[PDB]
Amino acid sequence: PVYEHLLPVNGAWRQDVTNWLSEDVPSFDFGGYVVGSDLKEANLYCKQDGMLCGVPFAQEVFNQCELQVEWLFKEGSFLEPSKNDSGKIVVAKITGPAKNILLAERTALNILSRSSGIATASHKIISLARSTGYKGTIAGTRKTTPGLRRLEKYSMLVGGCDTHRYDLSSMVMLKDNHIWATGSITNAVKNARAVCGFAVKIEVECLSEDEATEAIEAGADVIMLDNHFLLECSGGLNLLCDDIDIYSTSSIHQGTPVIDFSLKLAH
Amino acid sequence: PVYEHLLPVNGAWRQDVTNWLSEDVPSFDFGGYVVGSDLKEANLYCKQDGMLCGVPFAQEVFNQCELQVEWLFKEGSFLEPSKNDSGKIVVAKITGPAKNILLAERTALNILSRSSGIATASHKIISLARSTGYKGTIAGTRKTTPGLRRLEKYSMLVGGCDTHRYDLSSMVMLKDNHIWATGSITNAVKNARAVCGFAVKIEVECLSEDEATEAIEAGADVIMLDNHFLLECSGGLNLLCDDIDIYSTSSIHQGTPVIDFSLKLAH
Amino acid sequence: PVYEHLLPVNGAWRQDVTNWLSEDVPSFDFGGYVVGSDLKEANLYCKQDGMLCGVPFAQEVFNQCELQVEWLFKEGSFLEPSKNDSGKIVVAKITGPAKNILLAERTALNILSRSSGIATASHKIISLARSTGYKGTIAGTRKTTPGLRRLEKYSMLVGGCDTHRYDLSSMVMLKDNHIWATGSITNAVKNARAVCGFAVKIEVECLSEDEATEAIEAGADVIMLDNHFLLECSGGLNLLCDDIDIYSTSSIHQGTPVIDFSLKLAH
Amino acid sequence: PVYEHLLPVNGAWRQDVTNWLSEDVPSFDFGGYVVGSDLKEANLYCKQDGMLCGVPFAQEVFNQCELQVEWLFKEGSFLEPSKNDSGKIVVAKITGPAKNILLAERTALNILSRSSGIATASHKIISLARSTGYKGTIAGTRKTTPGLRRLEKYSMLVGGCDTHRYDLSSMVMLKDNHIWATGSITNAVKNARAVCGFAVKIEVECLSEDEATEAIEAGADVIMLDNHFLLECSGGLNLLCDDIDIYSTSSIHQGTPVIDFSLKLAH
Amino acid sequence: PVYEHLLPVNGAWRQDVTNWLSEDVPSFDFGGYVVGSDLKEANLYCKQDGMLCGVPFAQEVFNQCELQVEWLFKEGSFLEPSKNDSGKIVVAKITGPAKNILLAERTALNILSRSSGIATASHKIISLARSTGYKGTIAGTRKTTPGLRRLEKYSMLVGGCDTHRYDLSSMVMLKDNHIWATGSITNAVKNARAVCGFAVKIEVECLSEDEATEAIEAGADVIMLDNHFLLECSGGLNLLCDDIDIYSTSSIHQGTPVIDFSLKLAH
Amino acid sequence: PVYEHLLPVNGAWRQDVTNWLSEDVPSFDFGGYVVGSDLKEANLYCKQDGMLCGVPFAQEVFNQCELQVEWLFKEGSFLEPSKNDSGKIVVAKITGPAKNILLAERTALNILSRSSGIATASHKIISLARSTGYKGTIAGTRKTTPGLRRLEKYSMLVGGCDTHRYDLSSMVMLKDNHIWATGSITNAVKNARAVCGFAVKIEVECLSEDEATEAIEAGADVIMLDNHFLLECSGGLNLLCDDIDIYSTSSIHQGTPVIDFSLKLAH
């Protein structure tokens, strides 16, 4: 299977790319006027060790900027520029009008650097968890960057981690506020079940042990301890793995370091 | 003066907040249905040492979610939760229907954590540069997160750094590609000047010394060395300060750590 | 709990109402010019027996048209105008400028008539299923009207039915095409599980009996026969109920009759 | 002439199709990831007797999903699957990547089923009216589904009915509220004429006989009785035809039954 | 009656104002930051003789910029600053935060200057036509400024002229291309009538005399000579009036001079 | 260099063209239905002496309407139809389906007529200024038509004039309100400099001579008298040129006469 197939042939995500382009040119592209439209060649370079992520998003930028691109690696490939003399690896060869290439360049690179960063941090944390013999899952959170949720979640997947719930519409998550708002975990779960129906799971944050058998009895699908039915642990921290099914961390995606990429025209 | 005044009373930025809200609820807010609309009180907590940033953006989220908020600190204030017994500081008191508060909570916090992160990294790097007796400026770059440029640039300012050029429409930046595309730095500068006019500056990346007096002679406003007229150094690295006017770094805003915030209802 | 709380205080749905208004006035509201802005009173009338649905959507139309409204019944209330002398029941009292009322009138009524229609058909089919002693659920489908999915699903809920999966992003549904595309139901389920993760259910359409224990063994959450784990029957038809957990029908929402409403100014 | 030519080569309607696609995939298309991009063949099937309608709209869905389609019948053709052994007729042959076909499938079918339903109900009511020797017109109304007005009106036309006024901007419609708001039918008509000008007709709902010669004298183009100049009757009901020019009914388009279509990949 | 009532309480036109605001501030309002939010008073001044037009549009700008305004004249009032000592007339008094006032100022004035210009040119040409004893109408055209059609048409009305058809959806206009495309004026009219129905007029451009009785016989509502049924003359020119019903000119709205307005804060 | 290269390959401007198309067809294109899709040939004619401007914008209309076009002149070429027998010059040859051509025709021409008008007025005023031996620049203003700023500024450039600042985000402009708001020109400039940074110029409107050396001392880049550092004169008027660097006038773009264009199908 191919991760990029998760993105619909057309939909809001492609309009996002258009809006990212507009964010960079609200009036006129002066540099484009001076550089002209002569066809040029260019190489996209990965300048740091990490996993390549964000290909279809970057590809869409190149498409809208009407360029021709040849990716040298599959998305998800782990790149190691430091095995290099030069300190970099060309992951793509681009051709098109000079102005178009230079227009696409910053936006496309901002996508790759951040997407790869998330994937790399994601893969690092799961391979690490995997090394201890842990068989459960490491999941992300909803603490994503405003407007970039689709991209960051996608990166989590590429990095080999679980995405966790996409949004507030996705898998219901009940807490203290929800439980005493209805009267009991049983009431919270029932009301939640009354509207989400059978198609979506309900997760309840439980602090006690009798706060959790009731939820399980109410029909909850996932139980969270917070520092048939699955068990989740919310905190992360590191170095702790027991037999919980899910360990969640915003560490695989938030406040994450980027992987440096670059682009240079040939001649 | 007040930084938030940089944001127009109304414009695209407020629609961005609406879209961030939609990103979290594409269908239905199940948790909101279960929690109900009873008025509740809540405190926004800063859980890490850093500079508070993103207030008006978070405030707009609260406004659209129809809540009442009292900020306890001015934007830009340096918060130090570790001076605490508890390990946190309440920077805001919120009141409104339970569902509305819980709807606003993740998006608002995603704004604050990232905005403060950028401001904190920005302030740290400039105060550091300032400590050596450096009188120039530390500037950001265009390597911002797709769709979040307005917020990140704003954060740079709050953190005390220069924003540098906002976009490709803003101050022209000529490089090798532009110079030989026209024939000479003089030609590149002239063509650029022919379209940007007097109202906008032109910056030319110069590698040589005769690559820079010509630019200065062509009328360039800023000259970059890249690793009447100002001088800029592109690389960063640290620990190097001479007499350049501008030192640019994506370090104050890209791949930056976030400042952890939280929100909890009272009762 | 209150169904309208499923709708976020703000989000795309309110912009939909604005767009519905624009759909009716692409240039000028000539009738509004002639009627003027004198404050008027008006009654919204239900002219057919059925369940009231679409209140918050209609309310939003009234809000944007700057009117004051008093609903006489709770959403979901079963109205019976034929118990009437007059043949109608006033479900709301509206006040505001004459032009504004007449602007809101068609769009608001188009919402109510269709929403109530779906709710009424939904409630009729589930109360009917309930009468035979059936304890399972009657669910809707994705055969909703383009652009009106949020409203129709909401109506399904009000009518007392299960919504089923909201969209292609919601609970995964594997079929023949997906199973041999991967090689086996086990492969289909695994790949699907590899990307949706733990937070979302996977449903597999099974035709055979060995086509279903494998799916159950693969970890599928729901199994469909199509004419721990739940069982669903896709066809509907009527008059057949056994012990399946879910019976799905587009009958509760597609090609559904509307409930006639009206609006008349007093004086 | 060809009905589809009524749709502009480009405009808002194509963006509507994009938004319908987004309505189905707010995050990720899990089924698409599992099915892959192998080219597949597929047949669109009409499973009920009725008139084919909505071709260009469905075609646009297929275009955006990057598929190749061959329609086997002209829009408007009356299909009769029950003349079948199989009970269905293939109205189109589709080819493209498996994921793309399955992405397009529900949205495209939701268009066809509803559009054909309206066309079929429209054609049935007009052919029926035509059979009595009636030479006037059967028109629709503004009681269309929010957001789907363009599609439903188009379907009315295909079905052979008059669309009636498209919106509040289109042909002015004065009633009691408008007449006493200005003082007299003559005043209502004059004010309306003062703003709509010569290019658009004015229709006045008249209850009396002296309520109608005045309107005709004021210059009204159409007169409605409501249960040089044309005459319209608003009610419908059936089985009544006299010599009015227009008989309007929401029956040809609202609360209308759908025509069932399907789509299945070959192999 | 009041012209501003032609604008729906809410719809696309208000979003246009928001977009005009964004067009002026794509990033940050530096001047707003420096001026601050102290409440200020200000007068809108009309600096040239002409008819005041565009009030509700300008008012919407002021509303979105959260200001308080008192208009001193009714829209349509003919202002004569040259009767002045000072050379200007205050048509409005504005109060609000300094930054907000200065934000609204250019956009609002760009609306007023152009709207009044169109109204003034419109009123001048019709009062002129009226002075010769002409009883027909002077109409505008579709040669409006891209994106500003609603505003310019509205201005035409205020100026006392007929708007003519709003768009291609409004009143059908057949020409040579349409007539021989179908075979005959009769065929062109019939096909056009087959889709626009009874609710909309059909106008046919006729060059001959037998090119016009046929159209009249086909049922055409308006006949154009181009340099029951109305007669129109397309050219304008001036100084020619006979007994045609409509004389059209882009002169009342295109390439029209603006009426100069200004805004100054007090203190 | 080529002016059209100032426009990004993709961005908001192309969506503007789509919206201009929608502005003309909110429902159905009746004329298109009657004319059909037969391929036709057509010539775009310039009917008045002036400079051709707006090519890429018009070209985009033609692209979206799926037509094939051959421009006979380069943008900026000065056309002189009055050197003609016929009184017109064909500047483009268009081919495509009849309906598509007729759909594109009004919008495309509305672009050309206005864009060329601005360019022609711009070129006339600068060539005039140039004839007196003036070596400075003639600049535009922000008094542009709402929504059409990109097009009008572009036209200014083509006409050979300076655009001046694009928007409120572009080059800061301080006035009296800003100077006493901060305390002194020095304070106004400093605060402005504190937020715009080094990349953008600051212009201060000075009335006195000591109101201008301070600004120059504060670091202001441009000084305006209003009726290292440049000098600007705001008024225009004509027939006055001294040694100022910039003379600004809304005359080159606002209330400007249009250049008449036309389009006719062959056969």
**Which DSSP string corresponds to C224-248?**
E-----EEEEE--------S-SEEE
> To 5 degrees, how large is the angle CA C219–CA C220–CA C225?
145
Instruction: Give the single-character DSSP code of D223.
Output: E
Q: Tokens 């279903």 identify what position?
A: C212
For E262, the enclosing helix (H) or strand (E) is strand E261-265
Amino acid at E161: C
From the candidates C143, C190, C201, C264, give the one annotated as an active-site residue.
Answer: C143
**Residue F31: CA atoms inside 13 Å, Cβ hemisphere, count?**
27
Hey, what are F166's tokens? 């694009």
One domain, residues E228 and E200 = yes
Q: Do A178 and B34 touch (CB under 8 A)?
A: yes
Which of F22, F115, F177, F258 is the best residue to mutate to test the E interface, defined by the most E CB atoms within 10 Å of its own CB?
F177
Could you give the CA distance from residue E173 to residue D226 in angstroms, rounded to a whole number? 31
CATH number at residue D175: 3.20.20.70
Chain B residues touching C17 at Cβ < 8 A: none
Hey, what are E100's tokens? 């907000």
One domain, residues A6 and A113 = yes
Q: Is B226 part of any known ligand binding site? A: yes
One domain, residues D78 and D173 = no
Which of C27, C33, C61, C101 is the best residue to mutate to test the E interface, defined by the most E CB atoms within 10 Å of its own CB?
C27
Q: In this structure, are residues A26 and B165 in contact, taking their beta carbons and an 8 Å threshold? A: no
Helix (H, G, I), strand (E, B) or coil at A87: coil
Resolution in A: 1.9
Q: In this structure, are residues B158 and B53 in contact, taking their beta carbons and an 8 Å threshold? A: yes
- The 10 Å CB-count burial string (b at 16+, else e) for E141-163 is bbbbbbbbbbbbbbbbbbbbbbb
Catalytic residue numbers of B?
143
Could you give the CA distance from residue C251 to residue C237 in angstroms, rounded to a whole number? 9
By C-alpha distance, which of E93, E102, E89, E82 is closest to E38? E102
Phi, psi of F192 (to 5 degrees): -60, -45
Residue of C11, C167, C169 with shortest CB distance to B25: C11
**H helix and E strand count, chain D:** 8, 12
Q: In this structure, are residues E7 and E13 in contact, taking their beta carbons and an 8 Å threshold? A: yes
Amino acid at C66: E
For D9, the enclosing helix (H) or strand (E) is none
Torsion region of F226: left, alpha or beta (phi above 0 gives left; psi -120 to 50 gives alpha): left
Could you give the CA distance from residue C125 to residue C132 in angstroms, rounded to a whole number? 11
Whole-angstrom CA distances from D265 to C210, D71, D118 are 23, 16, 27
Could you give the CA distance from residue C61 to residue F86 in angstroms, rounded to a whole number? 56
End-to-end Cα spacing for chain A: 38
Whole-angstrom CA distances from F186 to C242, F194, F215, F219, F250 are 85, 12, 6, 9, 29
Q: In this structure, are residues E207 and E225 in contact, taking their beta carbons and an 8 Å threshold? A: yes
Our measurement of the distance from residue C119's CA atom to the centroid of its chain's CA atoms, rounded to an integer in Å, reads 7
Which are the contacts of D147, defined by CB distance < 8 A and separation ≥ 6? Answer: C16, C19, C20, C23, C146, C147, C148, D16
User: Where does residue D93 rank: exposed (0-12), middle (13-18), buried (19+ CB within 10 A)?
Assistant: middle
- The CA distance from B138 to the nearest CA of chain A, in Å, is 20
One domain, residues A127 and A146 = no
Instruction: Give the single-character DSSP code of A200.
Output: B
Which are the contacts of A46, defined by CB distance < 8 A and separation ≥ 6? Answer: A52, A79, A81, A88, A89, A90, A91, A116, A259, A260, A261
Which are the contacts of F176, defined by CB distance < 8 A and separation ≥ 6? Answer: F205, F207
Could you give the CA distance from residue F60 to residue F17 in angstroms, rounded to a whole number? 7
Q: Angle at which helices B185-196 and B210-218 pack, to 10 degrees? A: 30
Phi, psi of F74 (to 5 degrees): -80, 145
One domain, residues C81 and C115 = yes
Q: In this structure, are residues A103 and A25 in contact, taking their beta carbons and an 8 Å threshold? A: yes
**Residue D198: CA atoms inside 13 Å, Cβ hemisphere, count?**
24
Helix (H, G, I), strand (E, B) or coil at D131: helix
Could you give the CA distance from residue F69 to residue F58 in angstroms, rounded to a whole number? 10
| Inter-chain CB pairs, A–D, below 8 Å | 59
By C-alpha distance, which of A143, A144, A131 is closest to A234? A143
Q: Tokens 């291309």 identify what position?
A: E177
Q: In this structure, are residues F148 and E148 in contact, taking their beta carbons and an 8 Å threshold? A: yes
Could you give the CA distance from residue C64 to residue C111 in angstroms, rounded to a whole number? 15
One domain, residues E141 and E251 = yes
Which of D154, D182, D198, D234 is the best residue to mutate to test the E interface, defined by the most E CB atoms within 10 Å of its own CB?
D198
List all chains that touch chain D, counting a touch as 3 or more CB pairs closer than 8 Å. A, B, C, E, F
Beta bridge partners of A247: A138, A233
| Inter-chain CB pairs, C–E, below 8 Å | 59
By C-alpha distance, which of B39, C214, B153 is closest to E28? B153
Task: Could you list the beta-strand ranges (E) of chain C.
Answer: 39-46, 50-51, 68-71, 78-79, 89-97, 137-139, 172-174, 202-205, 222-224, 230-234, 246-248, 261-265
Q: How many CB atoms lie within 10 A of CB C209?
A: 9
Instruction: Give the single-character DSSP code of D200.
Output: B
By C-alpha distance, which of B38, F67, D61 is closest to F58? F67
One domain, residues F158 and F119 = no
Q: Do A245 and C198 touch (CB under 8 A)?
A: yes
Q: In this structure, are residues A140 and A252 in contact, taking their beta carbons and an 8 Å threshold? A: yes
Beta strands E39-46; E261-265: pairing state:
antiparallel
Chain D residue nearest residue C165, CA to CA: D24
Whole-angstrom CA distances from C71 to C9, C53, C262 are 19, 12, 14
Residue count (chain B): 267
One domain, residues C12 and C119 = yes
- The CA distance from A147 to the nearest CA of chain E, in Å, is 17
User: Where does residue A227 rank: exposed (0-12), middle (13-18), buried (19+ CB within 10 A)?
Assistant: exposed
Amino acid at C173: M
Hey, what are F163's tokens? 């655009």
Whole-angstrom CA distances from D207 to D168, D175, D181, D215, D217 are 22, 10, 17, 11, 16
Q: How many CB atoms lie within 10 A of CB E238?
A: 12
Could you give the CA distance from residue B11 to residue E24 in angstroms, rounded to a whole number? 9
By C-alpha distance, which of F242, F238, F236, F180 is closest to F205? F180
Amino acid at E126: I
* Helix/strand/coil percent split, chain C, to 5: 40, 20, 40
Torsion region of B147: left, alpha or beta (phi above 0 gives left; psi -120 to 50 gives alpha): left
One domain, residues F27 and F61 = yes
What value does the CA radius of gyration of chain D take, rounded to a whole number of Å? 22
Chain E residues touching F192 at Cβ < 8 A: 30-31, 33-34
List all chains that touch chain A, counting a touch as 3 or more CB pairs closer than 8 Å. B, C, D, E, F
Which are the contacts of D15, defined by CB distance < 8 A and separation ≥ 6? Answer: F18
User: Where does residue B147 rank: exposed (0-12), middle (13-18), buried (19+ CB within 10 A)?
Assistant: buried
Q: Do C27 and E150 touch (CB under 8 A)?
A: yes
Residue of B18, B34, B100 with shortest CB distance to C1: B34
Could you give the CA distance from residue E79 to residue D216 in angstroms, rounded to a whole number? 39
Could you give the CA distance from residue C249 to residue C235 in angstroms, rounded to a whole number? 7
Hey, what are C189's tokens? 């389920």
User: Where does residue A266 rank: exposed (0-12), middle (13-18), buried (19+ CB within 10 A)?
Assistant: exposed
Beta strands D68-71; B50-51: pairing state:
unpaired
Q: In this structure, are residues D199 and E164 in contact, taking their beta carbons and an 8 Å threshold? A: yes
C143 is known as an active-site residue: yes
List all chains that touch chain B, counting a touch as 3 or more CB pairs closer than 8 Å. A, C, D, E, F
Hey, what are B56's tokens? 């008006």
Could you give the CA distance from residue D31 to residue C189 in angstroms, rounded to a whole number? 10
Phi, psi of E65 (to 5 degrees): -90, 10
By C-alpha distance, which of F154, F166, F164, F155 is closest to F249? F164
Which are the contacts of B30, defined by CB distance < 8 A and separation ≥ 6? Answer: A168, A169, A172, A192, A195, A196, A200, C6
User: Where does residue F9 rank: exposed (0-12), middle (13-18), buried (19+ CB within 10 A)?
Assistant: buried
One domain, residues F251 and F265 = no
Could you give the CA distance from residue F267 to residue F255 in angstroms, rounded to a whole number? 38
| Inter-chain CB pairs, E–F, below 8 Å | 173
CATH number at residue A22: 3.90.1170.20
Could you give the CA distance from residue E139 to residue E119 in angstroms, rounded to a whole number? 13
By C-alpha distance, which of C60, C61, C70, C67 is closest to C90? C70
What value does the CA radius of gyration of chain B take, rounded to a whole number of Å? 22
One domain, residues A92 and A59 = yes
Helix (H, G, I), strand (E, B) or coil at F237: coil
User: Where does residue B202 rank: exposed (0-12), middle (13-18), buried (19+ CB within 10 A)?
Assistant: buried
Which of B2, B3, B6, B153 is the best residue to mutate to test the E interface, defined by the most E CB atoms within 10 Å of its own CB?
B6
Could you give the CA distance from residue E144 to residue F106 in angstroms, rounded to a whole number? 9
One domain, residues B159 and B247 = yes
Q: Do F2 and A32 touch (CB under 8 A)?
A: no
Which are the contacts of C89, defined by CB distance < 8 A and separation ≥ 6? Answer: C45, C46, C79, C80, C81
Long-range contacts of E224-231 (CB under 8 A, 24+ apart): E224/E173, E228/D228, E230/D198
Could you give the CA distance from residue D259 to residue B31 in angstroms, rounded to a whole number? 37
User: Where does residue B136 rank: exposed (0-12), middle (13-18), buried (19+ CB within 10 A)?
Assistant: buried
Beta strands E222-224; E230-234: pairing state:
parallel
For A181, the enclosing helix (H) or strand (E) is helix A176-182
Could you give the CA distance from residue C200 to residue C170 in angstroms, rounded to a whole number? 7
Question: Residues C171, C176, C177, C181: what is their CA dihedral angle, to the nearest 10 degrees?
Answer: 100
User: Where does residue C135 rank: exposed (0-12), middle (13-18), buried (19+ CB within 10 A)?
Assistant: exposed
Q: Tokens 């089924």 identify what position?
A: D31
Hey, what are E51's tokens? 């008819």
- The CA distance from C197 to the nearest CA of chain A, in Å, is 6
- The CA distance from A216 to the nearest CA of chain C, in Å, is 12
Q: In this structure, are residues E173 and E26 in contact, taking their beta carbons and an 8 Å threshold? A: no
Residue count (chain C): 267
By C-alpha distance, which of E185, E202, E184 is closest to E193? E202
Q: Tokens 């990429």 identify what position?
A: A261
Q: In this structure, are residues A223 and A246 in contact, taking their beta carbons and an 8 Å threshold? A: no
Phi, psi of D265 (to 5 degrees): -75, 150
Hey, what are F181's tokens? 């708001």
Residue of A9, A149, A166 with shortest CB distance to D65: A9
If one counts the domains in chain F, the total is 2
Could you give the CA distance from residue D34 to residue D98 in angstroms, rounded to a whole number? 10
By C-alpha distance, which of C132, C136, C131 is closest to C243? C136
- The 10 Å CB-count burial string (b at 16+, else e) for D185-220 is bbbbbbbbbbbbbbbbbbbbbbeeeebbebbbebeb
Amino acid at A102: L
Query: What range defines the domain where residue C158 resides?
Result: 134-255
Helix (H, G, I), strand (E, B) or coil at F243: coil
Chain E residues touching B169 at Cβ < 8 A: 26
Hey, what are A80's tokens? 């190691």
Chain A residues touching F167 at Cβ < 8 A: 26-27
By C-alpha distance, which of D145, B199, C243 is closest to F230? B199
Whole-angstrom CA distances from A82 to A46, A79, A92, A255, B251 are 10, 9, 18, 24, 21
Q: Do A153 and D103 touch (CB under 8 A)?
A: no
Q: Angle at which helices D12-24 and D55-64 pack, to 10 degrees? A: 60
Whole-angstrom CA distances from F110 to A15, A159, B124, F88, F93 are 27, 52, 54, 17, 18
Q: Is A143 part of any known ligand binding site? A: yes
